[PDB]
Design a binder for this molecule. Structure first.
Ligand SMILES: CC(C)(C)c1ccc(N(C(=O)c2c[nH]cn2)[C@@H](C(=O)NC2CCCCC2)c2cccnc2)cc1
Ligand SMILES: CC(C)(C)c1ccc(N(C(=O)c2c[nH]cn2)[C@@H](C(=O)NC2CCCCC2)c2cccnc2)cc1
Lengths: 305, 305
């Protein structure tokens, strides 16, 4: 028993992290087969950040302008190209540690693990969610750019996020591994702010089920509710609409605990209206929304990789 | 910026996890050089748990009674011995992935990462603390036994914990890698409960500094306090005594932020007496005590491994 913010084991991603240097800027890159993927803003200078002309900047660059280091080993760059906001550096050595992998674009509300890196070296791993406003609330310092987010399914690493930058709000923004930003953000130093975020209702519900599985049951009330009446209340507290797909997705937790989803919705309704009155749920004084239903199932059933 | 519960990258420990089977019981083992370390209760049966005679049970066991699997590869056991509550199985193949490592016994209040495993396969990684009552608040299911906790310093993995069992309270107990339990607990099915836990005051203070570094400053008041007056208040709220060693250890955070430790103590005093009044700190509605000062420094300075 117990419940923790649990990340995927990071060993498969660790063997893919390299350091990419271009002029004075260093950041991280991802090495899969004989390609290194990293943020294109590595080719910016301090004179370039407000409105870089990325095509023009790249043109003045030779392969030899790119210094790629895997640990202490230099990898020789033999090609370079730009795909959306990502650079692809073809190198003359394929990564012998390339895992089975794919590139996916995740949906707001989904979660992934982040292997934060600096100068090509791993520093820490933590679990994140794609917020409804397409930001993530990560922990990243200067030089973290190129750190990646991933899920693991079985033996296959699905890469979903590459870190590009921090917004003035202190939240973080980036791209899928095709270089397309999540949200309306751009890789230049300009005014751009996140939309108002919202609470991932289906995740909050998944977490309430995890509480019940762990024996924390005081918030369960005697009522039910309709989907429509639940959503009118939740709207007021800045919760996202719960759809029938969300309900279906909560099926495994409802079956395990015996609590119908609409019944759990009535308990959450009461928590929103009345608060928790000093009590805690799974050691938290707040409703948590960064566990998906699948995360709860996986952590309370022991899925390994 | 940002602040997360951040674990150490787990790749070095992943390459050390094996499956150990003895009769019908399976659990995890740690493979370093040509030795596999695992909990001795693997040699128990369902008829043995109340008061196992471990010496007698081990005697009736041959090397061939131990099935060790690294992935799908069987490792042949060529010796076996018992050290305190841990089994040491000498195998005929040394782990080619053995990292530089040592075994340490940690102090209450310190933190470590846990690589939770099932049947020798990694499932997730999260960060934990040794509670003052020598339990840990982990996330572990049946078969997690033998999962280990560790810190990483530079290139060296310091192993500090091996998971042995769950208490009826749902908290977890285990040993150092010499097989000596943390706390008064024993590896048998008998009545044994944790002492009353307490809050790790020096950790709470480290977390308040992390808040300030991240720009969350509303709880800072205009007062100072003496160490003695602070501890009289903290005693009431079940906080541990803050010692001068704790103050010295907070030196780097005080220097970085400009806030004297005793000044930060006056702000924490007010939070204990008045509560937070609906406000949050680093996204939490509760005071967090599972970040050590070193964790804060490392996460707000980017130390890599
Ligand atoms: C050129 C461009 C696109 C404007 C840029 C500039 C700096 C960086 N940041 C690098 O740390 C970094 C950059 N190159 C190597 N390191 C940081 C970053 O985003 N500050 C933004 C701060 C608001 C104003 C725009 C820039 C950063 C800090 C913390 C976590 N994440 C990233 C990222 C992008
Ligand atoms: C023989 C002995 C020492 C009594 C024992 C028995 C079972 C286990 N548990 C194994 O899961 C397990 C054991 N062997 C393979 N798996 C579980 C465990 O501790 N239940 C305790 C529950 C209270 C009463 C005593 C046993 C476990 C569950 C969840 C997380 N951690 C461990 C551990 C030790």
């Amino acid at each position: 028993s117990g419940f923790r913010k649990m990340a995927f084991p990071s060993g498969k991603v660790e063997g893919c992290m390299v350091q990419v240097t271009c002029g004075t800027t260093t950041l991280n890159g991802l090495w899969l087969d004989d390609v290194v993927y990293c943020p294109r803003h590595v080719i910016c200078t301090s004179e370039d950040m407000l409105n870089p002309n990325y095509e023009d900047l790249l043109i003045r660059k030779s392969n030899h302008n790119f210094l790629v280091q895997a640990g202490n080993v230099q990898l020789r760059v033999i090609g370079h190209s730009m795909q959306n906001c990502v650079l692809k550096l073809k190198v003359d050595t394929a990564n012998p540690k390339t895992p089975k992998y794919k590139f996916v674009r995740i949906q707001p509300g989904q979660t992934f693990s982040v292997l934060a890196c600096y100068n090509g070296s791993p520093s820490g791993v933590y679990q994140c969610a794609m917020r409804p406003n397409f930001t993530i609330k990560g922990s990243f310092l200067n030089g973290s750019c190129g750190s990646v987010g991933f899920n693991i399914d079985y033996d296959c690493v699905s890469f979903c996020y590459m870190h590009h930058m921090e917004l003035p709000t202190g939240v973080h923004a980036g791209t899928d591994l095709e270089g397309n930003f999540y949200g309306p953000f751009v890789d230049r130093q300009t005014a751009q702010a996140a939309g108002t975020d919202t609470t991932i209702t289906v995740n909050v519900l998944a977490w309430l089920y995890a509480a019940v599985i762990n024996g924390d049951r005081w918030f369960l009330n005697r009522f039910t509710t309709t989907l429509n009446d639940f959503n009118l209340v939740a709207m007021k507290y800045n919760y996202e609409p719960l759809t029938q797909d969300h309900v279906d997705i909560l099926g495994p937790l409802s079956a395990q605990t015996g609590i119908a989803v609409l019944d759990m919705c009535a308990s959450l309704k009461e928590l929103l209206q009345n608060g928790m009155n000093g009590r805690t749920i799974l050691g938290s004084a707040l409703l948590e929304d960064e566990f998906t239903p699948f995360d709860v199932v996986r952590q309370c059933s022991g899925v390994t990789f």
